[PDB]
Ligand binder design. Structure first.
Ligand SMILES: Nc1ncnc2c1ncn2[C@@H]1O[C@H](COP(=O)(O)OC(=O)c2ccccc2)[C@@H](O)[C@H]1O
Length: 517
């Protein structure tokens, strides 16, 4: 792969690539479609609109939007203007967005109408710098000063040239969270999505122009931003976008061509979703679908899920690991070489190391902490120098995973070096769940650990000590939390216990709980 040039604007690079196919569909969702030519026009009009309201080069805008054809207009339009979109999870609380507005110093917000209520609460409570709120597909009347996305874009002539950015300039941020503390702003450059799209989208997956891409992972996840924006636009594939929560039925509807007259050829999602599909009574047959490739990431793929999928569809599931810090996948199975129970082999272009307890070498078959060296790594966590130093070794990125290298050069997942749990392939901190539980007046103490379900997928499990002299049923506790946590964070089971195993300092011995004590 040839490196990008030093003067490089990634949005211009994706528009230029598709000038050969102006009338092909670039994106289609449940109510709209853009051709490459329409996407270019709207992208450049939005770039002009952001500049016309005073947002300058290098400044941030918050992009809080459901998957749909306006999302890549917003993302690429900011980048074309050399403004930095901060693309965020759509399932967070007002308090999380308030933090993001302050931390990013976002100067504008591009928000889906269905997300406007949570955004409103974030704006009201924060010391933010937002100059304009631009609403895509409003779901209630606009407040004074707010502008509808379609009119904001339509009111401005297309910007004539992109910002003259450098390849190593910041282009966008994503946020990721650890087991405590606020979300961390992961800063990516213009070159980083070129590298992931060339080294993985093109050179590993072999995506091509005639593909129809469909990602159950949304565009704000680093996995989905590659799958359903940067990879397809790099090869001129058409992309199906879906705003609603991915369920088996919603996904099957699109597999069978129920939206936009298109059947996906490339599907993308978490192992939890593939298990949910394989359990569904109305799983389509082979002859009803056009899939040629199935990608998975976010959590380890249990071998039995890959094997059942291959037996049903005659397609393997290609499991690769990526992170928000590395932007996309750097260690993966290949479309034509899958070994289930491993994450495959290093993606050419990326170097992988396993380190022991002092940074030293680890013999094959022994676990070591995983470190990555490659060209798409983030530059830092914005405004967090300590956490940055810890993760950005020195050209090496620490992943927070342990791995074992096998005799054939493949790597087998061996768990995290922290307490985080990927449930449904999405981060869940057990300590957040514990903090929610102990605010119930009938709970005295709680401890949450990961436990493998019957499919070998990790789910949280809660051990709860009730407060003597209060009542507390399992049903009452399920109601308390349904209300306060996202569904993927719900404990699979709660066990009421008389006491928890502790050190003399009172530290809970969470390892004893995973050992089944
Ligand atoms: N296949 C896998 N097997 C085992 N663990 C996997 C995995 N893919 C992700 N992970 C886990 O999620 C972590 C990354 O989470 P994050 O949500 O930042 O990004 C993706 O999850 C992400 C970002 C871009 C592309 C792909 C995934 C990895 O450090 C690892 O613990």
């Amino acid at each position: 792969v040839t490196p990008p040039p030093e003067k490089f604007n990634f949005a211009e690079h994706l528009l230029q690539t598709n000038r050969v196919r102006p009338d092909k569909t670039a994106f289609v969702d449940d109510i709209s479609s853009l051709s490459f030519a329409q996407l270019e026009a709207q992208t450049r009009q939005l770039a002009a609109a952001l500049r016309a309201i005073g947002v300058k080069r290098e400044e941030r805008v918050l992009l809080l939007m459901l998957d749909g054809t306006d999302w890549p207009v917003a993302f690429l339009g900011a980048i074309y203007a050399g403004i930095v979109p901060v693309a965020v999870n759509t399932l967070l609380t007002a308090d999380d967005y308030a933090y993001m507005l302050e931390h990013s110093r976002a100067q504008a917000v591009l928000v889906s109408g269905a997300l406007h209520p949570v955004l409103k609460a974030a704006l009201t409570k924060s010391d933010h710098e937002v100059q304009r709120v631009i609403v895509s597909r409003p779901a209630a009347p606009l407040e004074p000063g707010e502008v509808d996305f379609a009119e904001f874009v339509g009111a401005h002539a297309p910007l004539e040239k992109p910002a003259a950015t450098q390849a190593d300039d910041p282009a966008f941020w994503l946020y990721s969270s650890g087991s405590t503390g606020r979300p961390k702003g992961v800063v990516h450059t213009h070159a980083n999505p070129y590298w992931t799209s060339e080294l993985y989208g093109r050179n590993t997956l072999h995506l091509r122009e005639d593909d129809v891409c469909f990602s159950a992972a949304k565009l704000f996840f680093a996995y989905g931003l590659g799958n359903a924006l940067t990879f397809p636009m790099t090869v001129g594939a058409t992309t199906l976008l879906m705003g609603e929560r991915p369920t088996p039925d919603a996904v099957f509807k699109r597999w069978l061509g129920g939206v936009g007259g298109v059947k996906p050829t490339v599907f993308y999602g978490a192992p939890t979703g593939y298990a949910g599909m394989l359990a569904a009574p109305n799983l389509p047959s082979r002859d009803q679908v056009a899939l040629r490739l199935a990608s998975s990431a976010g959590e380890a793929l249990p071998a039995e899920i890959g094997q059942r999928f291959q037996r049903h569809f005659g397609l393997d599931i290609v499991d690769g690991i990526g992170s928000t810090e590395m932007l996309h996948i750097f260690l993966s199975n290949l479309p034509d070489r899958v070994r289930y129970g491993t994450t495959g082999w290093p993606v050419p272009g990326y170097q992988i190391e396993l380190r022991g307890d002092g940074g030293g070498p680890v013999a094959d078959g022994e676990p070591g902490d995983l470190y990555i060296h490659g060209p798409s790594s983030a530059t830092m966590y914005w405004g967090n120098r300590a956490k940055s130093r810890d993760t950005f070794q020195g050209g090496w990125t620490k992943s927070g995973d342990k791995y074992v290298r096998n005799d054939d050069g493949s790597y087998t997942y061996a768990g995290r070096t922290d307490d985080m749990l990927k449930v449904s392939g999405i981060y869940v901190s057990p300590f957040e769940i514990e903090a929610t539980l102990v605010q119930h007046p009938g709970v005295l103490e709680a401890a949450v650990v990961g436990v493998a379900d019957e499919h070998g997928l990790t789910k949280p499990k809660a051990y709860v000590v009730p407060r003597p002299g209060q009542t507390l049923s399992e049903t009452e506790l399920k109601t308390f939390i349904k209300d306060r946590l996202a569904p993927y964070k719900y404990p699979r089971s709660t066990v009421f216990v008389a006491e928890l195993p502790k050190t003399a300092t009172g530290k809970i011995q969470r390892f004893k709980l995973r050992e089944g004590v």
